[PDB]
Design a binder for these strands. Structure first.
Ligand SMILES: [Mg+2]
Ligand SMILES: [Zn+2]
Ligand SMILES: [Zn+2]
Ligand SMILES: [Zn+2]
Lengths: 204, 49, 66, 263, 97, 51, 133, 436, 185, 113
RNA sequence: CAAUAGGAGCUUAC
C-alpha cells in the first residue's frame, strides 16, 4: 500500500516521493467538492519546462468531462487554445484554473489552483525495500569487516571522501572511532626488539 | 579496507522534506531508532531513566 | 482488474454501475451520455468508470487448477 | 439566528443554503460529515474456500468497501469498549457469503446482494448491504467459473472515516459561498478581463451582482453558504446532516466536560 | 599585444615593448625566465582566471595555498603521482595514494 | 567457457518482466560493445543518421 | 495634541504599480513649497486628484501590546477617516531650508518637505498620520 | 536512538565539508528521513529518490566533536567563498516575496495565527500599519517579527531613492523592514544579505533559528493564500506574439543577409578567425540576440499576477531564459560548441536540401515549448539534450579524479601554532596563513 | 559516380511512403497511396488477404536503411508536399522553407511520431518537453507497476508486481493501441 | 513497517489526558491549551467563535506537525475575565447555535415533504 | 549459541 517515501512519477520526467498524506477533509476542495488525489509543487514546471505536463492535465480534464480519451499524439494539429475552448464550453475556466477552498478553514484561496486528472505511475522503488540499519552483525571471514549488502545485514562504506570531510572538520576522534570501534579493530603483540608481529602469546 | 571501510552503527533510507523541523533536526524512523543504539554509561544522574 | 467499489477521489459508489454502463454502450450511446444517465457528474467519478479496464475476463480464462 | 433553506432534498443527496453562521461553523460541519460520522463497514473477513482468480486481500478490500445500512448504528458500541472476547452479538454484525459456479459454460457473478446477515444486535436495523431499489443487484464482488467457489464470513463493525475511508457516509460535499466575490476573498487570474474569462457560480442568480457605482465594503463577512451533501446509501442525507451536527455537538460537550472536570 | 606561441626572452628584449610587464600564460616559461616568485604570481593568475571565468569566486587563501605547495621546492611540482610521490614523506602516505 | 575473458559479456540477459512495456522494450534493445575503457564521447552522441 | 496640522491639495495619484495602494503628491494650500508624498490604501480611503485632505501628524492618539479598540473609549483618531502608524527612518536637516522627513507606515512610505520651523518638532521615533475627507 | 542525539548525516558524493553534517535527532514514524528544507542546498539533495546515510557516534568524545564542530548551525557560512551556503529556498522565498509586497495586507485573525506560529515571538502584538477604518497589517511587519532585533541592513539596487518608488533596495532598522521586497537578494545565500548579517552579529544559534522562523511564517501565509501555476501562465497575448514573431522574422532576414554576404565573398573576417568561423560566429550572435529580444518582449508582456513571473522575480526557481523558452522561443541548440552539424551529407536531416545554412536547418528552434516543437526541432533539441547528459555523465569522473589528487596533494597541510603553514615534513609552505 | 547495392544481414531499415517522382505524368509530386488502398486495408482483401506486404509489393511503401537515406528527400507530412497560400497564433509555424524554389520530394514520413521507440511512445505531447525529461521518462516508465502478463497466476517468478486497479490513460497516444498499454495499463 | 495505527487519531489512551492547561507567563492572564487527538475541525470552530468576543484579546491555534493529531491554542483575555470561562462560553454558544441549526433543518426537511 | 566466495548483467541518486 502506498506510504510516505514511495516513488511516483508522471509521464513527463516529473518524479517524486510522497512527503505526507492528508485525509479527505484536510485536502483543498473545489466548489463542487472535488478534492485532489495528489498535490505537486509549482516550482517543478518553470526550470524543467515540462509544458506537456500542464497540457496533458488540461486535455485529461476535458476528456473526462466530455467522456472520451484525449489524443496526445505528438506532432499533430492540436493546440492549447482549442483545448481551452472546449473546457470553457464545458463551463470551466479555460486555462484549467479553479476556485478552490482551504480544507482547514473553508476560506477561499487568494490564488486559483491548476486542477485536473493526470496519469501517474507507481515505480518499483519503495522505501520499505531500502530502509536499512545495522548495529552489529556478520563480518567477512577474510577482513573481519562488516559484510556488504542490505539483504545480508551489511554496513555502509565510510569511504575516502568521508574521511576527507572529517579531516576538514578536524574531528580526529570521530574518524578514529569510525575506522576502529565501528569496524575491524584488533589487538596484536609486537616484539620490542625486532618490531615484528612474530610474538607467540598465551594470554591464559 | 584502510582508506575507507564498512562501518557498524549506520543507517540509510530515502529522505523527505519537513517544513516543521528545525534546521539542525533530522527525522528518524522509529524502526531505525530502535535498530541503532547508543551506549550510555550508568551514573547517579541517569539511573532512574 | 474489476470495477472499483468507490471513486478514488471522492468515494461515490461506482461498483454497481459497470454492468449498466456496458448495457448503455451496447445500444449505441456514446460514453459521455451513458455516464450522464448513470448520474456521474464530477469528472473524478466519470474517469473512474470511463478508464476502467476489465482484466478479470482475461484472468478467468485459465482453467481452475482445483 | 442561524438559518437553513433547503433547495433540493432526496434520500441520497440534500442541497441546502446555510446562512447567518460563521464560515468556521460551516466548514466544521462539512469536515464532520466527511470524516467523523460513524457508519458500519466490514472490518474483518474470514476465508473458508476461495478458488477464484482474485486474491484474498483483493476480495477483502472490496468487501470492506461495501456500504451497509447504518440507520441504527448509533445505538451500537465500538468493539474496543466491549468486555466481550472474539466478536459477540452486540458490538458486531456477522455476514455470510456463499457462491459457486456449476457447469462448464458461462460466468457466475458474485454481487453484494448475495451477502446474508446472520447475527447482529437485533432488532436494530443495521448490517444489510445497501440496495438502491427492490430490483437492484448491488455491487460486483467477484466472478466465478466452473467449480470455483467462494466461502466467506465477514464481520461488520462501527467506525469513522478518520481511521479508514470505508466508514465515510459521504462521497462529495460541494461547498461554496459569495458567488460574486463581493468580499474580495479571491483575486482572479486573467489575460484580458477577469469578468469575461470566469464562469458564473451555479448560485450566482441567488445574490445581487455588485453595482458599478459600488465601493468596496470592509465590514461584510461571509454570511450565506451553499452546500450539497451526497451519501452512499449507508445513511440518508438528512441523517448524515443531523448526525454530523450531533457529533460536533458531542465533541464540544466533551471539551466542555474536560474543562469543567479539570477544576 | 596578444600572441600565439611563446618566446618570452626574445620578445622582452625587442625595443618598443614594456620589458617590465611582458607576461606569459605558460608559467614553466616564467620559471625558466623570471624565477620562482614570478612563477607563483603567474600560477595564481591562471588559477584565478580558470575559476572566475564563470563568475565563481574562490577566496584568495585557497588558491594561494595551492600555488605555494606547487612552488615550494623551487620548481613546479605537479599534482600527479610523478610529483606527489617524489617527496620525502613517509612510505605509507605515498603508497596510500 | 574456458575463454570467458576476451569473450563478449552481456549478450544474453534475463528478460525483464516487471511490466509489459518493459518487456516490449527489452525485446527491442541494442548494445554497442565499445566499452567504458575510453572517454570518447563521440559514439555516445545522438547522431543525425539515427533518425 | 498634534505635531503637524495642515491642509493639502492632491496633485497626482499614480495607482499604477499596485492595486490596493496609491502614491499621492500634494502641496499645502496655505504654505507652498511644503510637499507631501504618501502611500495610502485605496480600498480603505480612496483618493482622487485635486481633492483636499486635512493631514495631521501626531506622536499619540490619546487625549505596548495592541488590542482591538472598544466603542466606549475615545482617542484623537475619532475625528478622522484614515489613520496610519509609522516609523521615522530619516530626518534630513539638509540644505538652506529644505527639511525632509521619512516615515515608513509598515512599508507604505511618506516624505515631507518644508522649512525647518515647520518640521523641527517632527524629529521623533514613531509618528501617527491622520486624514479627513 | 532518542531525541536530540547528535548523529552525523551524509549524502554522497561528499564534495566538501558541508556535505556531511551533524544533526539532532527527532523520532518519527513513516520510514523516511526528514530534513529541514534549507539544508538541502549544502547536501545538493532533493526528494525524488535520494537516500542519505546516518552515522551514530558511539562515545562521548565523538558526541562532543560532532556537536561542537560538525553541527549544522556552525556550517552556515563557508570558507570556500566566505558567504553563507544555507538560505531561504523553493517556496519560502516565493512566499516571502509575495508577502512583503507593498499592497499585501492581513486582517487581525490571520495576523494572530502568524504571530503564534513564530517560535521566538515575545508575546507582543505589533501595532497595525493602518488603524482606521479597519486594522490592517502589512506583510513586511509580519516578516520583521521573524527577524531578531539589533539587525541593520541597507542595500541599493540601481540607485533607488529613500522613498523607493519601485519598492526595490532594502532597509532594515533594528530588525524592522522599512521598504523593499524581500527576495533572493535579501534571504538568499549571497554575501552581505540578511543571513550573513545575522550570522556575523548574533551567532550560529540565532541564525539557525531565523531559518525556522521565516519558514514557518511564510509557509502559513502561503498555505492560506495559495500559489499555483497553470498552462495560462506561459501564454502571451496576441500583440506580444506579433512582436515576438516579427523579431524572429527580422533575425531570419538578418541571417539570410549574412549568408548572401558570405556567398558573394564580401564578409569582413576577424583576427585569429576564419571566414567560415566568422560567418558562424556572426550567425550565432544574431540568433542568440534574437532569442534574447523575443524573451525580453515576453517578459515585458507578463503581468504581476503571472505565476512564472512571480517565481522568477522571487528568484526561487527559473530565470529569464526559462520564460523565453516557454513563451517566446526555444532558440538555438548547440552540439559541441557549434550549431547542429551536417550529420548527413551536407545536411542535418534528410528533410533538408544540400548546403542549406539557414537557421532552421542547423538547429534553430523557432517555436516555444507551449507552442510545441516540430519533428525537426524535436530531433535537434534531442541531440542537444543528449550532449548535455553525456557531458554530465562523463566529466564527473575527471572532476572526481582531480579532486582526489588535490586532496592527496594537500591532505598533510596544517596551520601551526606559530602561524606558519607547514606539511608533515615540517617544511614551510607559507610563513603566515593566507598572508593575513 | 558510384552505385552501391547492399543485401547484407543486420542493416536497420524503416518504411516510408513513396511520392511519385517521375516527371512525365499528372500524378507527379503526390503520394502514390490513395483511398482505394485504405479501403482495401479496412476490407481485408483486394477487389480482384490484403495487408502490409501487399502495400510493400505494390510499390507504395518501401524500406530504406541509413545509407540509402543519404540520397532521399523526405517530406515530413503529406501536407508538406504542396506549398500553402494561415496566420494562426496558436498552431505552430510550419517552417518557411523559402531558399529552395521547387521541391522534388521522393518520400514522406508515414507519421513523424514513429521516430520514437516503445518507451518514448507512452509520453503524451513529448514535443512540449525538454529532451532530458523525455529521456528520464523513457527510463522510468520501465519501472512502473502494471500487469506484465495475464497468466501471472500460473507463473512462478522470483518477483512480480500487479496493480490492483489498472486504468487506461485519459490522454493517450496513437501508438499505445499497438503497445497494448490500454489493455494492460 | 513504521506506519502507526489509523485509530490512534481518535482513541484516547488511559495515560493521556484529553486536555492540558499551562499558563503563558510572558503576558498577563493568558493560557496555553493543548488538545490531544483533535484537528482543524474543532480548532477553527473554537478560534473563530472566540475571536469575536470583546473580552478576548488574543486567540490562536496551530498544528505543529501534520503527522501528529493534536493542536495547541493560545488564548488571552482582559483583566477581569478568565480565558477558561470565555472558553466554556464559546463552547456553549456553538452548542446552542448547532441545536438551533438542527431544529430548523428538521422542520425544513419535514416541510419539504 | 553460530547465515560462503568470486564474477557478469541490469538498475538508484548525484
Ligand atoms: Mg535526487
Ligand atoms: Zn623479535
Ligand atoms: Zn468521484
Ligand atoms: Zn462485544
Amino acid at each position: 500500500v502506498p506510504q510516505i517515501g514511495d516513488k511516483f512519477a508522471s509521464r513527463h520526467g516529473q518524479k517524486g516521493t510522497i512527503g505526507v498524506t492528508y485525509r479527505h477533509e484536510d485536502m483543498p476542495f473545489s466548489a463542487e467538492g472535488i478534492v485532489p488525489d495528489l498535490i505537486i509543487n509549482p516550482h517543478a514546471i518553470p526550470s524543467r519546462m515540462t509544458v506537456a505536463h500542464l497540457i496533458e492535465c488540461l486535455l485529461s480534464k476535458v476528456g473526462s468531462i466530455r467522456g472520451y480519451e484525449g489524443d496526445a499524439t505528438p506532432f499533430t494539429d492540436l493546440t492549447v487554445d482549442a483545448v481551452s475552448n472546449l473546457l470553457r464550453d464545458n463551463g470551466y475556466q479555460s486555462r484549467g484554473f479553479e476556485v478552490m477552498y482551504n480544507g482547514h478553514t473553508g476560506k477561499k484561496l487568494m490564488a486559483q489552483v491548476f486542477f485536473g486528472p493526470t496519469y501517474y505511475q507507481r515505480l518499483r522503488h519503495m522505501v520499505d525495500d531500502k530502509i536499512h540499519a545495522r548495529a552489529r552483525g556478520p563480518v567477512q571471514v577474510l577482513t573481519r569487516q562488516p559484510v556488504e549488502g542490505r539483504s545480508r545485514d551489511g554496513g555502509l562504506r565510510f569511504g575516502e571522501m568521508e574521511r576527507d570531510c572529517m579531516i576538514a572538520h578536524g574531528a580526529a576522534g570521530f574518524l578514529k572511532e569510525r575506522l576502529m570501534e565501528a569496524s575491524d579493530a584488533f589487538r596484536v603483540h609486537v616484539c620490542g626488539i625486532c618490531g615484528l608481529m612474530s610474538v607467540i602469546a598465551n594470554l591464559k | 579496507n584502510l582508506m575507507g571501510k564498512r562501518v557498524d552503527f549506520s543507517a540509510r533510507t530515502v529522505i523527505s522534506g519537513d517544513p516543521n523541523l528545525e534546521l539542525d533536526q533530522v527525522g528518524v524512523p522509529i524502526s531505525i531508532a530502535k535498530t541503532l543504539s547508543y551506549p550510555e554509561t550508568v551514573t547517579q544522574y541517569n539511573i532512574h531513566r | 482488474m474489476i470495477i472499483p467499489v468507490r471513486c478514488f477521489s471522492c468515494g461515490k459508489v461506482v461498483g454497481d454501475k459497470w454492468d449498466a454502463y456496458l448495457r448503455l454502450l451496447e445500444e449505441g450511446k456514446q460514453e459521455g451520455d451513458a455516464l450522464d444517465e448513470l448520474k456521474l457528474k464530477r469528472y473524478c467519478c466519470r474517469r473512474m468508470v470511463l478508464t476502467h479496464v476489465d482484466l478479470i475476463e482475461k484472468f478467468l480464462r485459465y482453467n481452475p487448477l482445483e | 439566528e442561524p438559518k437553513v433553506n433547503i433547495i433540493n432534498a432526496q434520500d441520497d443527496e440534500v442541497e441546502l443554503m446555510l446562512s447567518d453562521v460563521n464560515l468556521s461553523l460551516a466548514n466544521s460541519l462539512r469536515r464532520t460529515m466527511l470524516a467523523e460520522v460513524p457508519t458500519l463497514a466490514i472490518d474483518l473477513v474470514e476465508i473458508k474456500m476461495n478458488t477464484s482468480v482474485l486474491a484474498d486481500e483483493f476480495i477483502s478490500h472490496r468487501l470492506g468497501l461495501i456500504p451497509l445500512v447504518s440507520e441504527d448504528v448509533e445505538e451500537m458500541k465500538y468493539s474496543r469498549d466491549c468486555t466481550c472476547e472474539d466478536y459477540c452479538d452486540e458490538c458486531s454484525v456477522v455476514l455470510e457469503l456463499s457462491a459457486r459456479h456449476e457447469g462448464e459454460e458461462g460466468t457466475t457473478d458474485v454481487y453484494s446482494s448475495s451477502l446474508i446477515k446472520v447475527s447482529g444486535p437485533g432488532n436494530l436495523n443495521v448490517g444489510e448491504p445497501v440496495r438502491r431499489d427492490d430490483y437492484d443487484q448491488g455491487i460486483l464482488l467477484c466472478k466465478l467459473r466452473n467449480h470455483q467457489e467462494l466461502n466467506i464470513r465477514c464481520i461488520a463493525k462501527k467506525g469513522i472515516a478518520k481511521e479508514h475511508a470505508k466508514w465515510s457516509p459521504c462521497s462529495a460535499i460541494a461547498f461554496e459561498y459569495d458567488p460574486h466575490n463581493k468580499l474580495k476573498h479571491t483575486d482572479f487570474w486573467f489575460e484580458v478581463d477577469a469578468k469575461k474569462e470566469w464562469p458564473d457560480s451555479k448560485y450566482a442568480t441567488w445574490e445581487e451582482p455588485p453595482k458599478p457605482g459600488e465601493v468596496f465594503d470592509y465590514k461584510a463577512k461571509p454570511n450565506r453558504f451553499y452546500m450539497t451533501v451526497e451519501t452512499t446509501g449507508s445513511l440518508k442525507a438528512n441523517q448524515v446532516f443531523s448526525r454530523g451536527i450531533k457529533t460536533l455537538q458531542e465533541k464540544l460537550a466533551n471539551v466542555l466536560f474536560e474543562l469543567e472536570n479539570s477544576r | 599585444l596578444e600572441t600565439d606561441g611563446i618566446n618570452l626572452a626574445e620578445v622582452m628584449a625587442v625595443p618598443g615593448v614594456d620589458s617590465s610587464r611582458t607576461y606569459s600564460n605558460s608559467f614553466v616559461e616564467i620559471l625558466s625566465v623570471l624565477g620562482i616568485e614570478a612563477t607563483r604570481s603567474s600560477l595564481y593568475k591562471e588559477i584565478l582566471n580558470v575559476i572566475a571565468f564563470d563568475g565563481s569566486y574562490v577566496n584568495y587563501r585557497h588558491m594561494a595555498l595551492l600555488v605555494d605547495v606547487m612552488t615550494s621546492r623551487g620548481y613546479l611540482m605537479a599534482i600527479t603521482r610523478h610529483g606527489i610521490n617524489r617527496a620525502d614523506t613517509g612510505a605509507l602516505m605515498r603508497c596510500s595514494f | 567457457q574456458k575463454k570467458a575473458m576476451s569473450s563478449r559479456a552481456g549478450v544474453s540477459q534475463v528478460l525483464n518482466r516487471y511490466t509489459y512495456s518493459s518487456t516490449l522494450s527489452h525485446l527491442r534493445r541494442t548494445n554497442t560493445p565499445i566499452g567504458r575503457d575510453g572517454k570518447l564521447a563521440k559514439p555516445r552522441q545522438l547522431h543525425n543518421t539515427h533518425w | 495634541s498634534a505635531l503637524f496640522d495642515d491642509i493639502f491639495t492632491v496633485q497626482t495619484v499614480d495607482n499604477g504599480r499596485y492595486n490596493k495602494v496609491s502614491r499621492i503628491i500634494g502641496i499645502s494650500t496655505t504654505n507652498s513649497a511644503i510637499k507631501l508624498t504618501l502611500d495610502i490604501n485605496n480600498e480603505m480611503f480612496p483618493v482622487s486628484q485635486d481633492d483636499s485632505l486635512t493631514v495631521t501628524l501626531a506622536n499619540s492618539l490619546s487625549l505596548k501590546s495592541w488590542r482591538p479598540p472598544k466603542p466606549t473609549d475615545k482617542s484623537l483618531a475619532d475625528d478622522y477617516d484614515y489613520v496610519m502608524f509609522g516609523t521615522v527612518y530619516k530626518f534630513e536637516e539638509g540644505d538652506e531650508d529644505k527639511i525632509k522627513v521619512y516615515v515608513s507606515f509598515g512599508g507604505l512610505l511618506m516624505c515631507l518637505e518644508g522649512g525647518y520651523k515647520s518640521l523641527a518638532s517632527l524629529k521623533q521615533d514613531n509618528l501617527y498620520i491622520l486624514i479627513r475627507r | 536512538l532518542m531525541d536530540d542525539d547528535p548523529v552525523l548525516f551524509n549524502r554522497q558524493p561528499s564534495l566538501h565539508k558541508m556535505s556531511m553534517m551533524a544533526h539532532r535527532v527527532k523520532v518519527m514514524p513513516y520510514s523516511t528521513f526528514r530534513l529541514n528544507l534549507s539544508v538541502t542546498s549544502p547536501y545538493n539533495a532533493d526528494f525524488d529518490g535520494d537516500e542519505m546515510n546516518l552515522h551514530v557516534p558511539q562515545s562521548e568524545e565523538t558526541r562532543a566533536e560532532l556537536s561542537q564542530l560538525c553541527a549544522v548551525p556552525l556550517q552556515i557560512v563557508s570558507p570556500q567563498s566566505n558567504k553563507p551556503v544555507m538560505g531561504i529556498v523553493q517556496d519560502t522565498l516565493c512566499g516571502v516575496r509575495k508577502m512583503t509586497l507593498r499592497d499585501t495586507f492581513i486582517e487581525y485573525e490571520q495576523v494572530m495565527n502568524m504571530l503564534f506560529w513564530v517560535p521566538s515571538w515575545d508575546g507582543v502584538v505589533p501595532q497595525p500599519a493602518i488603524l482606521k477604518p479597519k486594522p490592517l497589517w502589512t506583510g513586511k511587519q509580519l516578516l520583521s517579527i521573524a527577524i531578531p532585533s539589533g539587525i541593520h541592513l541597507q542595500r541599493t539596487d540601481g540607485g533607488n531613492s529613500l522613498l523607493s518608488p519601485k519598492d526595490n533596495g532594502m532597509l532594515i532598522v533594528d530588525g524592522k523592514v522599512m521598504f523593499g521586497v524581500v527576495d533572493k537578494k535579501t534571504v538568499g545565500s549571497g554575501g552581505g544579505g540578511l543571513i550573513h548579517t545575522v550570522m556575523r552579529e548574533k551567532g550560529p544559534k540565532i541564525c539557525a533559528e531565523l531559518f525556522g522562523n521565516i519558514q514557518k511564517v511564510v509557509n502559513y501565509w502561503l498555505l492560506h493564500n495559495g500559489f499555483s501555476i497553470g498552462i495560462g501562465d506561459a501564454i502571451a497575448d496576441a500583440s506580444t506574439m506579433k512582436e515576438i514573431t516579427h523579431a524572429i522574422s527580422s533575425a531570419k532576414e538578418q541571417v539570410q543577409e549574412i549568408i548572401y554576404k558570405a556567398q558573394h565573398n564580401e564578409l569582413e573576417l576577424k583576427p585569429g578567425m576564419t571566414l567560415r568561423e566568422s560567418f558562424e560566429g556572426e550567425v550565432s550572435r544574431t540568433l542568440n540576440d534574437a532569442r534574447d529580444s523575443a524573451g525580453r518582449s515576453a517578459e515585458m508582456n507578463l503581468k504581476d499576477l503571472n505565476n512564472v513571473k512571480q517565481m522568477v522575480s522571487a528568484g526561487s526557481k527559473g530565470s529569464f531564459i526559462n520564460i523565453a523558452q516557454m513563451s517566446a522561443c526555444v532558440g538555438q541548440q548547440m552540439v559541441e560548441g557549434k550549431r547542429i552539424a551536417f550529420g548527413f551529407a551536407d545536411r542535418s536531416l534528410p528533410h533538408f536540401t544540400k548546403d542549406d545554412f539557414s537557421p532552421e536547418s542547423k538547429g534553430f528552434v523557432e517555436n516555444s515549448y507551449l507552442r510545441g516543437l516540430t519533428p525537426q526541432e524535436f530531433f535537434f533539441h534531442a541531440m542537444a539534450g543528449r550532449e548535455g547528459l553525456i557531458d554530465t555523465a562523463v566529466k564527473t569522473a575527471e572532476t572526481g579524479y582531480i579532486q582526489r589528487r588535490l586532496v592527496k596533494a594537500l591532505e598533510d597541510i596544517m596551520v601551526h601554532y606559530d602561524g606558519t603553514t607547514r606539511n608533515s615534513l615540517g617544511d614551510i609552505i607559507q610563513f603566515l596563513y593566507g598572508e593575513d | 559516380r558510384e552505385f552501391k547495392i547492399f543485401t547484407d544481414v543486420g542493416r536497420v531499415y524503416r518504411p516510408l511512403f513513396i511520392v511519385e517522382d517521375d516527371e512525365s505524368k499528372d500524378n507527379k509530386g503526390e503520394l502514390r497511396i490513395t483511398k482505394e488502398h485504405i479501403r482495401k486495408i479496412q476490407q481485408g482483401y483486394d477487389d480482384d488477404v490484403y495487408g502490409w506486404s501487399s502495400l510493400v509489393t505494390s510499390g507504395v511503401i518501401e524500406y530504406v536503411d541509413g545509407e540509402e537515406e543519404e540520397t532521399i528527400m523526405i517530406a515530413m507530412t503529406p501536407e508538406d508536399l504542396q506549398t500553402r497560400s494561415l496566420n494562426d497564433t496558436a498552431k505552430r509555424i510550419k517552417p518557411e522553407m523559402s531558399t529552395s524554389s521547387h521541391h522534388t520530394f521522393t518520400h514522406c514520413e508515414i507519421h513523424p511520431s514513429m521516430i520514437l521507440g516503445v518507451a518514448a511512445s507512452i509520453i503524451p505531447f513529448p514535443d512540449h518537453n525538454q529532451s532530458p525529461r523525455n529521456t528520464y521518462q523513457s527510463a522510468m516508465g520501465k519501472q512502473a507497476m502494471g500487469v506484465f502478463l495475464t497468466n501471472y497466476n500460473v507463473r512462478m517468478d522470483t518477483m512480480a508486481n500487479i496493480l490492483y486497479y489498472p486504468q487506461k490513460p485519459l490522454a493517450k497516444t496513437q501508438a499505445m493501441e499497438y503497445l497494448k498499454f490500454r489493455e494492460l495499463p | 513497517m513504521n506506519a502507526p495505527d489509523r485509530f490512534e487519531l481518535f482513541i484516547l489512551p488511559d495515560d493521556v489526558p484529553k486536555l492540558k492547561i499551562t499558563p503563558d507567563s510572558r503576558v498577563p492572564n493568558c493560557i496555553i491549551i493543548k488538545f490531544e487527538r483533535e484537528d482543524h475541525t474543532l480548532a477553527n470552530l473554537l478560534r473563530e467563535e472566540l475571536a469575536l468576543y470583546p473580552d478576548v484579546t488574543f486567540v490562536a491555534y496551530k498544528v505543529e506537525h501534520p503527522l501528529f493529531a493534536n493542536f495547541v491554542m493560545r488564548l488571552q483575555t482582559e483583566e477581569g475575565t478568565r480565558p477558561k470561562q470565555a472558553l466554556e462560553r464559546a463552547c456553549a454558544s456553538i452548542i446552542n447555535k448547532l441545536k438551533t441549526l438542527d431544529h430548523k433543518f428538521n422542520e425544513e426537511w419535514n416541510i419539504k415533504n
